[PDB]
Design a protein around this nucleic acid. Structure first.
Ligand code: DCT
Ligand code: MG
Length: 528
DNA sequence: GACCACGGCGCC
DNA sequence: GGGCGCCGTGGTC
């Protein structure tokens, strides 16, 4: 039943944007649904001034757009989060809708009505889900607001810097491709893997080390190519071209084009329901994968700067995953090396050369790397490799024990979970194909650690944001086990110290949570 | 122009 | 080799 725009309080929104990014979208339509009536706003924008909060599907998004228009409108209940927690594979409105009672259409009114209806069913399904309900009420919902503020804020970028970088890299790529072409004895599209495969394996005589997955073609991966670096002198030239071209096309060239007019900052999206483990995801500008490994990568990182008069504050948990594993495992020995405070790697071993061998087996257990994978990972083949791990599970019995327990529970229950009860169903755990089953197994015992580490971070963000706001500081980015903040120079140290303390004691476990902090005028300098 | 599958690769 | 998202290349509509 259609009723005049002003909806009663507690209504469920329903809006249509001209595009996916709320920071670039136009509010084409806005509607609300309550009880049984449906109210449409004749003027969406002015309408927003009537809502006290965004209640409904993708609330945060409409909330982001409200913020960009100077409206405090906070996001509230959002069935997507409910569905997401019930099943982490619930990632789109299209799917949750079809799966729980509706159709994701393009009408603001039907979307609003869809929101209400969807929330009822989903909420009901959360019956007796004390843990899931806890994650919704105490983490998911409240965090949805932190994210809206994060996206609205944005991060300052050195646009003239990257532009200068572009021309310079362009010339280096040209010298590189010019060189490989002379080595192949002729040019070709070096961006074409198919064309490069023929040059490497077909035309030249380089041994094809591996084949692709879906198409089964001879691969030209960096791995295949790193091994072939000794053969032809073209291999290296190709390897640098790839890096350069990867960095230019992905960061140096598109980023400056994404700056916002009204802000002059990069406004990335922080998707709350796009991962199977419970991790967050950054899209459109994906600011969760900015380079940092190679020199040129670092030159790019320096491009992310703080407002004039502010400082960047980067905080990273220290191997939060190995720690969550110690807690999850309850492995005295592991929980002891952290307690305490001995170099995980160093202490594990109990040299240098070996320390690069005792940290890999400790972290490679997060996916259970194969002995053949380790043989080629280290020096000693699958002979001493399998052994150079026989002590891992021999030193850390409960870990291997835990991995076993989680899996069995996974086969029986049909899903696995995090310290807080976040769950993920891994059906292929009972598959008849070794190949697929052991693949599910790796996703299976990995989820708890990755998901627990995420729950912890999401909770840290939830508690830290308010204090930050009270301090005049801001949360800019999150990169899974780290956060990037922005604070006035006069408060940077006080903000760093606080965030660090908040993050470290977010949720005490058998082992301490260690956080390293850094301040600087740019991301690289803040020591990210 | 918009979008797809795929190989490849950036980060956690 | 666990979790993502983005970029060209080829090829579709
Ligand atoms: N190559 C990697 C790196 C990280 N991770 C996961 C497990 C650890 C978590 C955070 O990664 P980093 O921040 O890179 O490492 P860290 O060990 O947590 O901490 P530090 O910053 O001291 O390296 O993400 C992963 O799966 N694969
Ligand atoms: Mg870290």
């Amino acid at each position: 039943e259609e009723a005049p725009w002003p909806p009663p309080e507690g209504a469920f929104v329903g809006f249509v944007l001209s595009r996916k990014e709320p920071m670039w979208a136009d509010l084409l339509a806005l509607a609300a649904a309550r009880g049984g009536r449906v109210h449409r706003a004749p003027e969406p924008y002015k309408a927003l001034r009537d809502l006290k909060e965004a209640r409904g599907l993708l609330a945060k998004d409409l909330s982001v757009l409200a913020l960009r228009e100077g409206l405090g409108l906070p996001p509230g209940d959002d069935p997507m989060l409910l569905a997401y927690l019930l099943d982490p594979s619930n990632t789109t409105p299209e799917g949750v809708a079809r799966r729980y009672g509706g159709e994701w259409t393009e009408e603001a009114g039907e979307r609003a009505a869809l929101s209400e209806r969807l929330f009822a069913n989903l909420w009901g399904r959360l019956e007796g889900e004390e843990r899931l309900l806890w994650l919704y009420r105490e983490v998911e919902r409240p965090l949805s607001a932190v994210l809206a503020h994060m996206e609205a804020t944005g991060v300052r970028l050195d646009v003239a810097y990257l532009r200068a970088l572009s021309l310079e890299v362009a010339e280096e790529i040209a010298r590189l491709e010019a060189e490989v072409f002379r080595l192949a004895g002729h040019p070709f599209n070096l961006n074409s893997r198919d064309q490069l495969e023929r040059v490497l394996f077909d035309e030249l005589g380089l041994p094809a080390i591996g084949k692709t997955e879906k198409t089964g073609k001879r691969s030209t991966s960096a791995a295949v190519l790193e091994a072939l670096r000794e053969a032809h002198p073209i291999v290296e030239k190709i390897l640098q071209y790839r890096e350069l071209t990867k960095l230019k096309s992905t960061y140096i060239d598109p980023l400056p084009d994404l700056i916002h007019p009204r802000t002059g900052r990069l406004h990335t999206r922080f998707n709350q329901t796009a991962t199977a483990t419970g991790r967050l995801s950054s899209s459109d500008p994906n600011l969760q994968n900015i380079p940092v490994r190679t020199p040129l990568g670092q030159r790019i990182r320096r491009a992310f700067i703080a407002e004039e008069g502010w400082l960047l504050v980067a905080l990273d948990y220290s191997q939060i995953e190995l720690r969550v594993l110690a807690h999850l495992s309850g492995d005295e020995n592991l929980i002891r090396v952290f307690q305490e405070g001995r170099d995980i790697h160093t202490e594990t071993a109990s040299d240098p050369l070996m320390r690069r061998a005792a940290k890999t087996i400790n972290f490679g257990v997060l996916y259970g790397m194969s002995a053949h994978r380790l043989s080629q990972e280290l020096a000693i083949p699958y002979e001493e490799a399998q052994a150079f791990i026989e002590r891992y599970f021999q030193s850390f019995p409960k870990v291997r024990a835990w991995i076993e327990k989680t899996l069995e529970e996974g086969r029986r229950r049909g899903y696995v979970e995090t310290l807080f009860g976040r769950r993920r169903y891994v059906p292929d755990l009972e598959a008849r194909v070794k190949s697929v089953r052991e693949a599910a197994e790796r996703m299976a015992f990995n989820m708890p650690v990755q998901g627990t580490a995420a729950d912890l971070m999401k909770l840290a963000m939830v508690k830290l944001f308010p204090r930050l706001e009270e301090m005049g500081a801001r949360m800019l980015l999150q990169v899974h086990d780290e956060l990037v903040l922005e604070a006035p120079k006069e408060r940077a140290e006080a903000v760093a110290r606080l965030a660090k303390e908040v993050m470290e004691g977010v949720y005490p476990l058998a082992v301490p949570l260690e956080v390293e902090v850094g301040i600087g005028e740019d991301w690289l300098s803040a020591k990210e």
